[PDB]
């Protein structure tokens, strides 16, 4: 049984930290593609 | 074969329909007798 309310499992990540980390990743990633490109991130597509 | 209903039919949040209350027989210590077991399963583990 559940000794209380049913709640959704979840996980929190700091928003500013993630945005800064992703910015660092793009800054380093551009070195292999060029400084006049657009780097876009998207979620996964197929599979289970 | 499991006979399942929704665990929390009045939930108006996520987890609505994610946890199912499934009835099944299952064996006991002796091969001549069966029991009746009620348990909850997550939707991802159970297919219709």
């Amino acid at each position, epitope marked *: 049984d559940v000794l209380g309310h049913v709640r*959704m499992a979840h996980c929190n990540i700091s928003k500013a930290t993630w945005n800064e980390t992703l910015g660092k990743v793009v800054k380093q990633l551009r070195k292999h593609f060029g400084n006049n490109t657009i780097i876009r991130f998207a979620q996964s597509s197929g599979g289970d | 074969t499991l006979q399942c209903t929704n665990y929390a039919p*009045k939930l*108006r949040s996520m987890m609505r329909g994610e946890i199912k209350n499934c009835s099944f027989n299952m064996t006991t210590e002796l091969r001549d007798k069966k029991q009746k077991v009620y348990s909850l399963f997550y939707r991802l583990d159970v297919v219709q």
Partner: antibody
Amino acid sequence: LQLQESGPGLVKPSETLSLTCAVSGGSISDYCWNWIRQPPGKGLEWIGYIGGSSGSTYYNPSLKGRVTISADTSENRFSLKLSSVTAADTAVYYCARSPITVFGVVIFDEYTTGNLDLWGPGTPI
Amino acid sequence: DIQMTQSPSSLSASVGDKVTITCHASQDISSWLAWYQQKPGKAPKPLIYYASSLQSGVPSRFSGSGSGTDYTLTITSLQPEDFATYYCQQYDDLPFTFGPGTKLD
């Protein structure tokens, strides 16, 4: 805190009715918003509601399909659309505010609501 | 679709009388019952939420209680502003429903 509705005073058969409600003195994200119908001489019928910060919507099994409820927090407003309006849908429509008692994550609708604390003037249709 | 009834459908009363309005649910609603007062031509206004909790701004003359399937609203002094149609709202489960209403006269 005042709620004020608007929209056409009547639509023709098979047209979509679009009603709006403005929130003045408060913020949509902290409350849930309900729409209630009252045909003339009859009692109250719940149409549906939309949450605040979660954006989730729920509809009555009556008025099956047809009903769309939405909100726009950038203008602190929300609206109701009813497609394929017929003669039986003429009524006074109200918007209303409901409180949220939060026990879990608000963005997952982990709260108890349903009480109506504030009613608008009403819009006869 | 939870059903709700009210009793009486019309209650005869004079000014200053103590009155009780009852509501009967088809199933236990765990006290998640709200009471509203509606006047002709106006939107209903709140009185009570969660069966017994009084809404802020509502005179202390209004009270109520109940459990299970049986709930009551008590008005201790029926002043002229209180001759209104009263409604029960059941929010324990969705869709939300309302009773037929009881008229005071």
